[PDB]
Structures are given as structure tokens and as C-alpha cells.
Nucleic acid binder design. Structure first.
Ligand SMILES: Nc1ncnc2c1ncn2[C@@H]1O[C@H](COP(=O)(O)OP(=O)(O)O)[C@@H](O)[C@H]1O
Ligand code: BEF
Ligand SMILES: [Mg+2]
Length: 509
DNA sequence: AAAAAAA
């Protein structure tokens, strides 16, 4: 369809709750709720989104705004407004459906809705139910029946599982569709589900198949999403709202970025520990940080080290997809509340998760996708606070830092090399209690992980994978050693006819 | 065998 740009404007008349109230856009009850949150003033994207999202019964909406700049309320407020605008029509039906790439994010958005509810008990009538995977279906549906929610937040899969069973009962009158972190939801493995959801909701709707308004939000998107969103967009023209200049980088300016480069990938483990150690001393245990890792196993493994190396000083929270949803929710709450501590996680906590007052965002290795570099370091410097970011890598990963400059215009001015002392190496290797068999899996996971993103990050397959592989030897403290595997397994890997596979592995059946 | 996400 037709895309209409609305570029960033420096000379723009401000927008406030009071103005939007006096202008008649916002009813008193939502104003009352948002004002009590005692924000200085509406963030750019909020000022730019609210009126348009409510404005025409036509145009779809895309909105780009940097991390932690209030993109949530930027659509949660208009929704509530729309709910107030139609309180006598279909008062027991879902009118707004919000979708998010992870469960914790969905639950977080739900919690935000609950905050809105908390700031004004008059808005509790507009009930809200979350539909995410890893929780009891029956209970969720019991909640659905009980409350008759006007707002649903969900993850695609469970939402499909709900729709295929109860599309007629709750979802026959949706008017708004919200894709938070829209770009991720349009990636492979998500897009089909979103297209399915879109199809079902459009098919089921009573007024028309083009009734629903679609809202796309993310810190990272371009026009190339609209080509990917074409099948889920209904309206004839799309409203692109951008709080960022076209040339300007998507990364947040207030983030103090740096990158530590090592000879080997394993070294980055030593660099991170030495860095954290320095911070705890200089900050007197007043340290709140998030550290990212490529895989679940490397996360869990890194957690062991950090626990052995820093549990005297701080709490170490392990956070990844293989954690049960209860533990995830609880630890998320704890890290949200706690003043200090270290959150060791995969990319489950890369997008959208708002942990207040995080000092530093560390990264061992590279993200699952280029864009997720922006989101990762986005976990800090949120809501007007300052923040720092450190990227721990080795030379064989440097083509990634280059691709950060080429694609996203992101330049890390602060670079420096790193080589570990024998002391720190001894200290860390002493902190490893994992058997060789486990180390094997841990490194293999990294091999598999880094293999998948070679084409994406411009890596040299012949140079990168053996480096990742030698980690095994480094951890077992025998550099010349190779990972012991069976021929059939290496054949499953498909590297049996490769010099690399021979260079990284030792067939020991 | 490799974030996440449907069991
Ligand atoms: N208008 C505002 N002024 C100041 N802080 C805000 C405002 N709106 C939201 N926030 C804060 O921003 C934090 C995270 O914002 P979020 O909605 O996650 O932004 P994004 O989705 O763009 O990352 C929340 O803790 C919230 O309290
Ligand atoms: F809305 Be964002 F993903 F916090
Ligand atoms: Mg964000």
C-alpha cells in the first residue's frame, strides 16, 4: 500500500496530557492515570503517536523510537482512550490485541497495563488478560471467561492456540492490532504466525475484514518491514512516524559504548571477569549489570563462573528460555526491584525488558542478529538515565563490528586490546567445576551458534569456528587439544569432508 | 548440534 513518512522535526510544538485533554483527544480518566505517574513530560514518540493512532479510522501506523523512550504507553494510552470512546459497544469483547516476541515482555506489558489500572481504579473495568506460552491454558481461559478482557497481550503461538479454539467468543470485535518489536515478529519463524493471527482476526471481525488497525513498534526498523508487513496491514495508507533522523544511528546516544578485543574467544571470559571485578571495587558493590551470551549452555556455564567469582559481592541471576516461567517471572521481578546484581542471560532479555537503573550492559560474543546489538545495549540508559556498554570479543569476530558500521551506522569510538594474565586464567579455570563432557557440549553449542550467523556477520568460516572450538582446549588447559567426538556425530555436523572439521575435531570413537 | 517461540 501507500507509505507516508513523517520525519523527525526539531521545531515541533510540544504535546502534553493537559493539551490532549483540552483538545478533547483524551478523556479525563486516562489523563488522571498518566499524570499520577509523575513523568516530566511525554516522550517524543508518545507526543507523536497518540493523536494519530486515534485520529483516522483509516491509516495504519508504523512508529520508530529508540530504546527505553516509552514506546509502550505510546500505544497503551491510545488503546485505553479508544476503550473509553466505545465503552457501550461490545463491553465484554476484546478490542485490542498486543503481540510480543517473548513471554516476559508480554507479561511486562500486562504489568504496565496493571500500573495504568493502579493509577486509576476507574480503569479496572477495562480488564486485561495475558496469553503466553509456558502457562496453564485452562487457567488463562478461565481468566478470559471471568474478566472478559478488552485488552489481550500474547505471544503468537499460544494466541493461535487460543484463536483456533475460541476466536468466535472473544475476538470477533477487535479494532486494534499491536506488534511490539515489530521487526522481530516479522522474522522467519514468527511471520507465518502473525499472518495467521491477522488472517483469523480479519476473517472473524464483524464490521469488515479491513476494520482492524495495525500498529508496529520497534527501536529498529526501516521501510523493508512494510514489505514484510504488507500481508498483515489492512488500511490503504500507512503512517510512518520517526523520532530518528534517516542518517542518525538507531543506537541510543547516551549509551557509553566500548569493545574489548582479545586474541581468542575464550579470553573474553577473562576480560569480562576482570571488568566486573574492577566495577565492584570502584562502585563498592553498588553494581547492577546485564551480561549477554550466545547460547543457553554458555549462559549457564558463564553463570557458574560468575557465581564462583562474584557471589560474595552480588547476586547472580541465570535467565534463559530453559528456565521455567515462574522462575523467569520471579527473577525478572527481583532484578527489576533489586538495587544491584548481575543478570546473565541469552537474547530472551535483549528486547523490550525494562530493568530500571542498570549501570552496564556487557556482552560476551555476538547477538543472534545485528539489530539485537542495539536492543541489548538498550537495556541500559533507559528513561533518561545514563549508561555504559562493553562488547567482549576476539579478532575473528571483528567483521561483526564492521557490519555494525556498514548497516546501522554504529561506531564504537572506544576500542582496546586484551591479553589475560596467568593469574586470572588460573583463578577462572579454578572456578570451573564442569566435567569435560559438559565443556564439550558448551563449546559445541557455540560452534553451532556461530556457524548459523557466518553469512550474516561476514565471518571467515575457516578462521572463526576453530577459534570457537579451541575454547575446549583452553578451558581444559590443553591448547593443542581438540574436541573428542564420534565420526557419525561429525557426519551429523556435516563437517567430515571439511579441513575445518578436521582442524577443530578429533574423531575418538 | 544453534535466542526464541506450541506442546
Ligand atoms: N513519559 C515518560 N517519561 C518518563 N519516563 C517514562 C515515560 N513513559 C515511560 N517511561 C518509563 O520508561 C521505562 C521503559 O519504557 P518503555 O515503554 O519500555 O520504552 P521502550 O518500549 O521504547 O523501550 C518505564 O520504566 C517507564 O517508567
Ligand atoms: F516496548 Be519496548 F519493546 F519495551
Ligand atoms: Mg525498547
Amino acid at each position: 500500500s501507500k507509505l507516508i513518512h513523517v520525519p523527525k522535526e526539531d521545531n515541533s510544538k510540544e504535546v502534553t496530557l493537559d493539551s490532549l485533554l483540552e483538545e478533547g483527544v483524551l478523556d479525563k480518566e486516562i489523563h488522571k492515570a498518566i499524570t499520577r505517574m509523575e513523568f516530566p513530560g511525554l516522550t517524543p514518540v508518545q507526543q507523536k503517536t497518540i493523536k494519530p493512532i486515534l485520529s483516522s479510522e483509516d491509516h495504519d501506523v508504523i512508529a520508530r523510537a529508540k530504546t527505553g523512550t516509552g514506546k509502550t504507553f505510546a500505544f497503551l494510552i491510545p488503546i485505553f482512550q479508544h476503550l473509553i470512546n466505545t465503552k457501550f459497544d461490545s463491553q465484554y469483547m476484546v478490542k485490542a490485541v498486543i503481540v510480543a516476541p517473548t513471554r516476559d515482555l508480554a507479561l511486562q506489558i500486562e504489568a504496565e497495563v496493571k500500573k495504568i489500572h493502579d493509577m486509576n481504579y476507574g480503569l479496572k473495568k477495562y480488564a486485561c488478560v495475558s496469553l503466553v506460552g509456558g502457562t496453564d491454558f485452562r487457567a488463562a481461559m478461565n481468566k478470559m471467561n471471568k474478566l472478559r478482557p478488552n485488552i489481550v497481550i500474547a505471544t503468537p503461538g499460544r494466541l493461535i492456540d487460543v484463536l483456533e479454539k475460541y476466536s468466535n467468543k472473544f475476538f470477533r470485535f477487535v479494532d486494534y492490532k499491536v506488534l511490539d518489536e515489530a521487526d522481530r515478529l516479522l522474522e522467519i519463524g514468527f511471520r507465518d504466525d502473525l499472518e495467521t493471527i491477522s488472517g483469523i482476526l480479519n476473517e472473524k471481525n464483524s464490521k469488515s475484514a479491513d476494520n482492524i488497525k495495525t500498529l508496529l513498534f520497534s527501536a529498529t526498523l526501516d521501510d523493508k518491514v512494510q514489505k514484510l508487513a504488507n500481508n498483515i496491514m489492512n488500511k490503504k495508507e500507512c503512517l510512518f512516524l520517526d523520532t530518528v533522523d534517516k542518517n542518525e544511528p538507531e543506537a541510543h546516544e547516551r549509551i557509553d559504548q566500548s569493545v574489548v578485543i582479545s586474541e581468542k574467544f575464550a579470553n573474553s571470559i577473562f576480560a569480562a571477569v576482570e571488568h566486573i571485578k574492577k566495577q565492584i571495587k570502584e562502585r563498592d558493590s553498588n553494581y547492577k549489570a546485564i551480561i549477554f551470551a550466545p547460547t543457553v549452555k554458555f549462559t549457564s556455564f558463564l553463570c557458574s563462573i560468575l557465581k564462583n567469582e562474584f557471589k560474595k559481592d552480588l547476586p547472580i541471576l541465570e535467565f534463559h528460555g530453559k528456565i521455567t516461567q515462574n522462575k523467569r517471572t520471579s527473577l525478572v521481578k527481583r532484578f527489576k526491584k533489586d538495587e544491584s546484581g548481575i543478570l546473565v542471560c541469552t537474547d530472551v532479555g535483549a528486547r523490550g525488558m525494562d530493568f530500571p537503573n542498570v549501570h552496564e550492559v556487557l556482552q560476551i560474543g555476538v547477538p543472534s542478529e545485528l539489530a539485537n546489538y542495539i536492543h541489548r545495549i538498550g537495556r541500559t540508559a533507559r528513561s533518561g538515565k545514563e549508561g555504559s556498554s562493553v562488547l567482549f570479543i576476539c579478532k575473528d569476530e571483528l567483521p561483526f563490528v564492521r557490519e555494525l558500521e556498514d548497516a546501522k551506522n554504529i561506531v564504537i569510538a572506544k576500542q582496546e586490546k586484551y591479553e589475560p594474565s596467568e593469574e586470572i586464567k588460573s583463578e577462572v579455570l579454578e572456578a570451573v567445576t564442569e566435567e569435560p563432557e559438559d565443556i564439550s557440549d558448551i563449546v559445541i553449542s557455540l560452534i553451532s551458534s556461530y556457524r548459523s550467523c557466518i553469512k550474516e556477520y561476514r565471518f571467515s568460516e575457516r578462521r572463526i569456528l576453530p577459534e570457537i572450538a579451541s575454547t575446549y582446549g583452553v578451558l581444559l588447559n590443553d591448547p593443542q587439544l581438540k574436541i573428542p567426538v564420534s565420526r557419525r556425530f561429525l557426519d551429523k555436523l556435516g563437517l567430515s569432508r571439511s579441513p575445518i572439521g578436521k582442524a577443530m575435531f578429533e574423531i575418538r570413537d
